[PDB]
């Protein structure tokens, strides 16, 4: 079946710009090309059908065009609410096949993370394990690298790290980093550091608590 290919999966534009996102079909599609918007949650709206037609509700800042195998969606003047991943699907031969998608990140001024670091709860600890948690909040760009040092040595085994998707209201990201250990490995050390390295600084920005402290 026809493979839809979206070269570019990530794109960043500042809002004021004109975005173009490509879709190539593997077979001639005779203009039965639809473009969708997928928001970080569920939702999926059809923006253009039949290479060019705007579905009601869609802003005139979106244009579709192209022929044979190659098609484009253009966002003439990028608006903050346009962050989404944009999809094309061919409706010319069954089965219907969708492109991989292109996520559109809003380019923003760099923001430095505000770190927060938490000790284990009495509840987890009395229940056998300890997780030291480090929230590194509201930054830009996405790329950042946290390392956990216990008592001065980086720890490898036991780190979970997840980011939020771009903020809808202000375009930053937040990340959570959790180090898990036994109540016992934990009772044996004192300093727990969370060291984040980010575009906005020259030196790692560090938060720590000593457990001896408290």
């Amino acid at each position: 079946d026809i493979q839809m290919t979206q070269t570019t999966s990530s794109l960043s534009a500042s809002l004021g710009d004109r975005v173009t996102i490509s879709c190539r079909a593997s077979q001639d599609i005779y203009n039965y090309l639809n473009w969708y918007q997928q928001k970080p949650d569920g939702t999926v709206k059809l923006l253009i059908y039949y290479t060019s037609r705007l579905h009601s509700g869609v802003p005139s800042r979106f244009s579709g065009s192209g022929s044979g195998t190659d098609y484009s969606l253009t966002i003439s003047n990028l608006n903050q609410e346009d962050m989404a991943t944009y999809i094309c699907q061919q409706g010319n031969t069954l089965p219907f096949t969708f492109g991989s998608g292109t996520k559109l990140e809003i380019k923003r001024a760099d923001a430095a993370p505000t770190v927060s670091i938490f000790p284990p709860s009495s509840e987890q600890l009395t229940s056998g394990g300890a997780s030291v948690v480090c929230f590194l909040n509201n930054f830009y760009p996405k790329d950042i690298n946290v390392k956990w040092k216990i008592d001065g040595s980086e720890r490898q085994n036991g780190v979970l790290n997840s980011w939020t998707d771009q903020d809808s209201k202000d375009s930053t990201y937040s990340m959570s980093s959790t180090l898990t250990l036994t109540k016992d490995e934990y009772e044996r050390h004192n300093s727990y550091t969370c060291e984040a390295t980010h575009k906005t600084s020259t030196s790692p920005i560090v938060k720590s608590f000593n457990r001896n402290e408290c």
């Binding site: 949650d41 569920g42 939702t43 999926v44 938490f118 929230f135 909040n137 509201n138 980011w163 408290c214």
Partner: protein
């Protein structure tokens, strides 16, 4: 509103089956092509099959992959669409979408239901409150958080307190680690409270539990 709400999702074990249903309102359901799509984790969207409208009889199309194994039916009195899935494999885990009009102008997608086809069993979360070390850190605005460790299958919701003076709640997506799920949420609040008034996170994992944990200290 022109509602289409999907509903049979949850955990099924492999080789099992599930009835997915799609409820609609505010348009003539007989008039529209009704379609099922899914998005596996990671992957692109995958069309599974549609059923035509009264014009056309209510004839069905299916993709090579699901033909004979999935079956789309329709009830035009109640104005429910169904997707009976059989002999479900782990690769059938996905968010499944109900859709009105596939071929363009009246498009309307619901929000998906999640199926996990897996041989693991339901596990309710252990929920930990996260508060900072006494003595050692605050300034103006307090960040509290909650770790909901070790539950299965997905989706958990963490509720806090709703009063927009701060309350910059964050949700960090769940990650699998050693075959269970783990997520966290933060709230950040103005320091004029916490200490002073209560903040609680409530964690609702619909394969049956609600826990409500208080940020004390």
């Amino acid at each position: 509103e022109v509602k289409l709400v999907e509903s049979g999702g949850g955990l099924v074990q492999p080789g099992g089956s599930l009835r997915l249903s799609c409820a609609t309102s505010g348009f003539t359901f007989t008039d529209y092509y009704m379609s099922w799509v899914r998005q596996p984790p990671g992957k692109a969207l995958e069309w599974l099959g549609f059923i035509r409208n009264k014009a056309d009889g209510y004839t069905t199309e299916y993709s090579a992959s699901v033909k004979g194994r999935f079956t789309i039916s329709r009830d035009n009195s109640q104005s429910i669409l169904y997707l009976q899935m059989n002999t479900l494999r782990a690769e059938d885990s996905a968010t499944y979408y109900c859709t009105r009009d596939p071929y363009g102008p009246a498009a309307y997608w619901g929000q998906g239901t999640l199926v996990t086809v897996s041989a693991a069993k339901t596990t309710p979360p252990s929920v930990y409150p996260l508060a900072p070390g006494c003595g050692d850190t605050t300034g103006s605005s307090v960040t509290l958080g909650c770790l909901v460790k070790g539950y299965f299958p997905e989706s958990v919701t963490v509720t806090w307190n709703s009063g927009s003076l701060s309350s910059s709640v964050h949700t960090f997506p769940a990650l699998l680690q050693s075959g269970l799920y783990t997520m966290s949420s933060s709230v950040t609040v103005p320091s004029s409270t916490w200490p002073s008034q209560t903040v609680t996170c409530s964690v609702a994992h619909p394969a049956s539990s609600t826990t409500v944990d208080k940020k004390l200290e």
